[PDB]
């Protein structure tokens, strides 16, 4: 009959009671992890983003299994040995397996990355709170270059923490992320433009200096702010974002006249079929590399469109380039096929 | 399956001498990364810059590893599972750090199972990764794992070197 | 041709538009690609996939719970899934799944009563499927006996 | 204790023995109705036990001490 008092009772029982989530195939031990359940109305299980790595879980319809540890002993085993918070590092290599991915990386990249002047270049800010205030008031971009007074804690020889106030040269965005950063870590870690690869090192550093509890809080924090800024950015994918280099058709016609040369040298019966095959393939591989270089030069630094005195050159904020540069998604290889030349395909024989 | 941490210290002096992998020229795997979180079997006294002895049966913390780099240690004897004297398992010392914990391994842990899973999984996963995806040509895993299997199965090669 | 069609709509050539966050009212930092994608709802309704079971019918010979949601089944905790628990060292959880949660007949009933009485005590025995194995081996004509303590 | 068990593990040391110790204590509270040291703050037995161990109140050897103390006084009462 599912009576209303039964819901209160159910809520009572599940508090502090760990449940095991599993995803197939269970290749390593982290394919089963324990969590505190949060009861939700609605028929799907909700999984935490940061452990999607270990499960290899992507939500294209994936399913997971739930198990109830029954005994006091099993419940203890789950909370102590199997809890997601307790099992961060890969048992295979000594590396944190919980690392921000995708949108989170993207967002952090967006905040940390700098642009030329923009809104409020060379401002002076009291604390990162003033920065947050200014950004959200709409008097400063996240990429505005600025001077900011940060108080960074360096942990002493013993457990005691020694802090030091310093005026640093960073963006508004970086100052705001410093608020997520725990005291103990340095400011220079966040002072760079952040990507997936820098953030794994961030997490590692935090684990080694601070320990488990701090890192767990920090990881969640990073996730919240990451997504948060990912959304605010308004980052999207239009056909204009895939830039073809102007010199495609030229490069290609040249490569075709070249291949024609080796074909005519073949009809003469001089150059063997195998020699020609190899030379044609080398021609096209080299053409491919050339077009790709052109694409990436024209994209990576296409922001040749700046300011303050006169014309200046800078990193491109094109959406695909950002995704790829941050390590959030895509890579130069992918982008080659999108904007560049697709390149040489391999037969089912393996031959090209 | 059966391999478990049975003992704290086997009381052995044995172990393998790891060098930094300079296959070709580039430092493929730095000494530090290859040796971190291992027990030092045997010191090496080279008078040096930081005056390092680093005594026997010391787990290499990130601290001691940093000191190795400053001193430019060449190669080091490290205590290993293979060289353990513990019968019916291995000792915590010969294993070293439980990589998943970030400290010395606890006795009782079923290490074998962890090892097999850790080695097996990437192969099994990369067999799905660069194949649902693996498309265009600029190998992969399908060539590699047969080599690996031929190794773990101890198959003598078709035309072997003589010693 | 498509951009010319967008100009006939007085829509941007980029096909990206200025969008505002419904919560805050402020605009997003840059233009977002917006338009109509033709989308489908596939046959995989969560309604059909959701499933849960505490206790129910059990299999005929092996005595372990049946499989599949239509037969009100338990999930299989397979070799792969067992290895996970070995790795962790979660011994009681493992044993639990092998015994009180599966074949162990006495164990399951006793465990249920203990759970209703609060005390989450493990009272494990021997999986009936093991018993059966021995019997199968003896029907083969191999003497396989337990030498007791 | 609830989220992270790190400090509790640092008190006892062996994760597996921490499990055993907290479970034996939680069983006492569950069955015997043995009184908690730390304020429950509406928490379950297992969580109580882990807090207690973290703060360094419960110990395998300390449990063995209270076992013998009370059992021995029961034997004295019998005789």
């Amino acid at each position: 009959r599912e009576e209303a008092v039964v819901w209160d009772i159910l809520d009572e029982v599940i508090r502090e009671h760990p449940v095991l989530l599993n995803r197939a195939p269970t290749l390593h031990r982290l394919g089963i992890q324990a969590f505190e359940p949060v009861l939700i109305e609605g028929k799907a299980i909700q999984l935490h983003p940061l452990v999607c790595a270990a499960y290899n879980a992507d939500f294209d319809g994936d399913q997971m299994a739930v198990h109830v540890p029954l005994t006091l002993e099993a419940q203890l085993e789950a909370r102590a040995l199997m809890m997601s918070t307790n099992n961060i590092l890969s048992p295979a290599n000594g590396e944190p397996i919980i690392v921000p991915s995708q949108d989170v990386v993207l967002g952090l990249y967006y905040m940390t990355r700098d642009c030329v002047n923009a809104k409020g270049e060379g401002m002076v800010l009291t604390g990162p709170k003033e920065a947050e205030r200014l950004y959200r008031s709409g008097l400063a971009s996240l990429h505005a270059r600025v001077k900011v007074r940060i108080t960074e804690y360096e942990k002493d020889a013993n457990g005691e923490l020694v802090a030091k106030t310093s005026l640093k040269d960073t963006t508004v965005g970086r100052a705001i992320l410093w608020m997520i950063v725990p005291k103990g870590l340095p400011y220079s870690i966040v002072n760079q433009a952040l990507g997936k690869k820098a953030i794994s090192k961030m997490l590692n550093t935090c684990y080694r200096i601070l320990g488990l509890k701090p890192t767990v809080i920090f990881a969640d924090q990073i996730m919240y702010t990451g997504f948060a800024y990912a959304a605010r950015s308004g980052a999207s994918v239009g056909i204009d974002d895939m830039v073809i280099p102007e010199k495609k058709h030229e490069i290609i016609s040249e490569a075709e006249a070249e291949v024609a040369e080796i074909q005519e040298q073949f009809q003469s019966g001089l150059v063997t079929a195998g020699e020609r095959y190899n030379k044609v393939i080398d021609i096209w591989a080299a053409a491919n590399d050339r077009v790709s270089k052109a694409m990436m030069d024209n994209l990576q630094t296409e922001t040749v469109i700046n300011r303050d005195g006169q014309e200046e050159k800078q990193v491109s904020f094109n959406s695909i380039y950002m995704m790829a540069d941050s390590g959030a998604r895509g890579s130069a290889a992918q982008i080659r096929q999108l904007a560049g030349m697709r390149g040489l395909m391999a037969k089912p024989d393996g031959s090209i | 399956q059966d391999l478990v941490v049975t003992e704290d210290d086997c009381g052995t002096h044995e172990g393998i001498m790891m060098t930094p992998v300079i296959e070709g020229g580039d430092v493929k795997e730095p000494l530090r990364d290859r040796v971190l979180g291992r027990v030092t079997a045997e010191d090496v006294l080279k008078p040096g810059t930081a005056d390092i002895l680093v005594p026997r049966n010391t787990l290499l913390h990130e601290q001691w590893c940093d000191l190795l780099e400053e001193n430019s240690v060449d190669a080091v004897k490290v205590r290993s599972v293979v060289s353990c004297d513990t019968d019916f398992g291995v000792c915590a010392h010969c294993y070293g750090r439980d990589l998943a914990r970030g400290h010395i391994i606890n006795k009782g842990e079923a290490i074998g199972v962890i090892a097999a899973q850790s080695i097996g999984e990437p192969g099994t996963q990369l067999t799905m990764r660069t194949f649902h995806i693996g498309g265009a040509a600029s190998k992969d895993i399908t060539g590699g794992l047969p080599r690996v299997a031929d190794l773990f199965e101890a198959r003598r090669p078709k035309e072997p070197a003589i010693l | 041709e498509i951009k010319e069609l967008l100009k006939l709509g007085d829509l941007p050539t980029s096909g990206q538009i200025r969008l505002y966050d419904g919560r805050t009212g402020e605009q997003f930092e840059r233009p977002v690609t917006v338009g109509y994608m033709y989308m489908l709802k596939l046959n995989h309704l969560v309604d059909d996939k959701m499933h849960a079971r505490s206790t129910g019918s059990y299999s005929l010979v092996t005595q372990q719970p049946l499989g599949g949601k239509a037969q009100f089944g338990g999930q299989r905790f397979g070799e792969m899934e067992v290895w996970a628990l070995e790795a962790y060292g979660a011994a009681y959880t493992l044993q639990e799944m092998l015994t009180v949660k599966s074949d162990d007949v006495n164990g399951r009933t006793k465990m249920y009563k203990n759970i209703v009485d609060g005390n989450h005590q493990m009272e494990p025995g021997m999986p009936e499927s093991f018993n059966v194995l021995l019997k199968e081996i003896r029907s083969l004509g191999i003497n396989i006996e337990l030498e007791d303590e | 204790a609830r989220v992270t068990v790190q400090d509790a593990v640092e008190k006892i040391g062996n994760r597996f023995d921490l499990v055993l110790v907290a479970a034996r204590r939680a069983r006492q509270m569950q069955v015997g109705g043995k009184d908690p040291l730390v304020p429950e703050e509406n928490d379950k037995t297992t969580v109580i036990a882990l807090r207690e161990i973290e703060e360094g109140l419960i110990n395998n050897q300390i449990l063995d001490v209270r076992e013998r103390q009370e059992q021995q006084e029961q034997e004295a009462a019998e005789l």
């Binding site: 085993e77 | 478990v4 009782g108 842990e109 | 070995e86 979660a90 044993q95 | 023995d17 055993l20």
Partner: peptide
Amino acid sequence: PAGTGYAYHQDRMRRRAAG
């Protein structure tokens, strides 16, 4: 005979060794 079970298993093993 490993992990959580090592404690109980060594207790059983000492029972086996003393008869």
